[PDB]
Amino acid sequence: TRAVFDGSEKSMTLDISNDNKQLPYLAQAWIENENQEKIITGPVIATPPVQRLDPGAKSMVRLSTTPDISKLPQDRESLFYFNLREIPPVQIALCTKIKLFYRPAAIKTRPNEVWQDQLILNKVSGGYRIENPTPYYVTVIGLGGSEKQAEEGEFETVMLSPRSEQTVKSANYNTPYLSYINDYGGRPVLSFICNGSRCSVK
Amino acid sequence: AVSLDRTRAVFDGSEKSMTLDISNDNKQLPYLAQAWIENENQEKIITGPVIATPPVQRLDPGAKSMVRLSTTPDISKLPQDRESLFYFNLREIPPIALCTKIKLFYRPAAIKTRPNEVWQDQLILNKVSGGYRIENPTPYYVTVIGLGGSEKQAEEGEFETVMLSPRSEQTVKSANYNTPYLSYINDYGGRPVLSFICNGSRCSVK
DSSP: OEEEEOSSSSEEEEEEEOOOSSOOEEEEEEEEOTTOOEESSSSEEEEOSOOEEOTTOEEEEEEEEOGGGGGSOSSSOEEEEEEEEEEOOOEEEEEEEEEEEEOOGGGOOOTTOOGGGGOEEEEETTEEEEEEOSSSOEEEEEEESSHHHHHHOOSOOEEEOTTEEEEEEOOOOSSOEEEEOOTTSOOOEEEEEEETTEEEEO | OEEESOSEEEEETTSSEEEEEEEEOOSSSOEEEEEEEEETTSOEESSSSEEEESSEEEEOTTOEEEEEEEEOGGGGGSOSSSOEEEEEEEEEEOOOEEEEEEEEEEEOGGGOOOTTOOOGGGOEEEEETTEEEEEEOSSSOEEEEEEESSHHHHHHSOOOOEEEOTTEEEEEEOOOOSSOEEEEOOTTSOOOEEEEEEETTEEEEO
16 A cells, blocks of 8 residues: 655556456556646556556556656655556446655665654644654554554544644543554554643653 | 545536535444545646545544535635536555546536436437447536447447537547437436437437
């Protein structure tokens, strides 16, 4: 659901398949920027745009970077979405979107480093203002009053941009807990300790 | 699996908004429903002039809900003498999503119709080589769902559904019937069948 790249490889292929055992499908592929608008001008592209996949048949999509990848900020992450839509040739289709995180080598991490423990919760009316002081995107799943309640979250509540703040509507908890998705797809839980209006990771 | 209450919608421009019912038919798991508007080119618009709220909502197992469609003040820049086409989109997110797209016809208040008013009987069928050049001289989109040499064939026969835009024409491949029968879908989901009389290459409704 997420791929991190640094632009050292100009191309990548994804394996796609028609999982429908009976009908043929067209598979449309395209890139969107972080605001989820289609971009056909780079700096990440996908080919081919369209292709027919017969029942049970396998194929691939090629993702490439263009020279304009180097005009992106080099001290923070940039986000793209790879989109796949499958429609038989009320329109009902299968639609997938994978998050592509452009992570410049200047901000490459070590595997035993957790930047997500720098999140701050600010107690505001009707919820919290979360600060992400890091150069990376932080995908939050659950926010609760216990590890259990944070672990139950089934969806991505909010996604925090590099070096940013966002307000989320939430009940005020004495002991706030939040789960996030890491680079490997896991969902660790953080516990916060509050001091009046501000809570930091224990 | 989130489902919609209808397959097509008409936005009555004499109203400020309208609502669409959605329901989570999965009784076991919760889903997120993401809703957005597209323009006639199937391009996403998030500023107006037609908006869907909320953009994203949580549906609990078996829950029912709704999506509200509203106009911004920019809606007054669309043509007021013809309908405009938008698409209403719905994406379900499981805890491999499904995406539904219906047509949203925006009908300005100036061309508001009476409930038993028919305009699809103003289509003109022109016999061209290989078929018919169909003209829609009205301010509405008209969807033809069948064409044949009898009432039976217009309804029973398999036809490629063709949508005509306001005040335009489209050519469809077909046999040359002496007396053509055309079927369309109205705003109520009815499927009336028209019969044409051709004098020369021009056919109009009896």
